[PDB]
Amino acid sequence: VYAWNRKRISNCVADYSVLYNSASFSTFKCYGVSPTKLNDLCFTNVYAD
Amino acid sequence: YNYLFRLFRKSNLKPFERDISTEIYQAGSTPCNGVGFNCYFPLQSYGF
């Protein structure tokens, strides 16, 4: 966690609702964005820290 | 803790509308049924 690893997502479309509808995730939060509104929104790049 | 506000609702209040109910919320896809995750109590206290 002092030197976290980054993955890039670009040039594609997705369903984000799986990130809380899946039983695999114990907790989910969003900041500056709404959990439903993810499926309507767009971004220049997505980085997973 | 005797002062409170409603933090959770499905729709905004109309002009001079008011709401007494303590019915349990559903902030996400939990099958809530009045009982936990997304199942929030609708009021919060200020606790001044």
Curated annotation (Swiss-Prot), chain A:
Give the result of T27A, as annotated: In strain: Omicron/BA.2, Omicron/BA.2.12.1, Omicron/BA.4, Omicron/BA.5, Omicron/BQ.1.1, Omicron/XBB.1.5, Omicron/EG.5.1
Assembly: Binds to host ACE2. RBD also interacts with the N-linked glycan on 'Asn-90' of ACE2. Cleavage of S generates a polybasic C-terminal sequence on S1 that binds to host Neuropilin-1 (NRP1) and Neuropilin-2 (NRP2) receptors. Interacts with host integrin alpha-5/beta-1 (ITGA5:ITGB1) and with ACE2 in complex with integrin alpha-5/beta-1 (ITGA5:ITGB1). May interact via cytoplasmic c-terminus with M protein. May interact (via N-terminus) with host bilirubin and biliverdin, thereby preventing antibody binding to the SARS-CoV-2 spike NTD via an allosteric mechanism.
The source's superkingdom equals Viruses
| Protein's name in the database | Spike protein S1
- Annotated source species: Severe acute respiratory syndrome coronavirus 2
Mutagenesis or variant effect for L19I: In strain: Omicron/XBB.1.5, Omicron/EG.5.1
Please give the function described in this protein's UniProt entry: Attaches the virion to the cell membrane by interacting with host receptor, initiating the infection. The major receptor is host ACE2. When S2/S2' has been cleaved, binding to the receptor triggers direct fusion at the cell membrane. When S2/S2' has not been cleaved, binding to the receptor results in internalization of the virus by endocytosis using host TFRC and GRM2 and leading to fusion of the virion membrane with the host endosomal membrane. Alternatively, may use NRP1/NRP2 and integrin as entry receptors.
Parent-record interval covered: 350 to 398 of 1273
Q: Could you say what the effect of mutating S22F is?
A: In strain: Omicron/BA.2, Omicron/BA.2.12.1, Omicron/BA.2.75, Omicron/BA.4, Omicron/BA.5, Omicron/BQ.1.1, Omicron/XBB.1.5, Omicron/EG.5.1
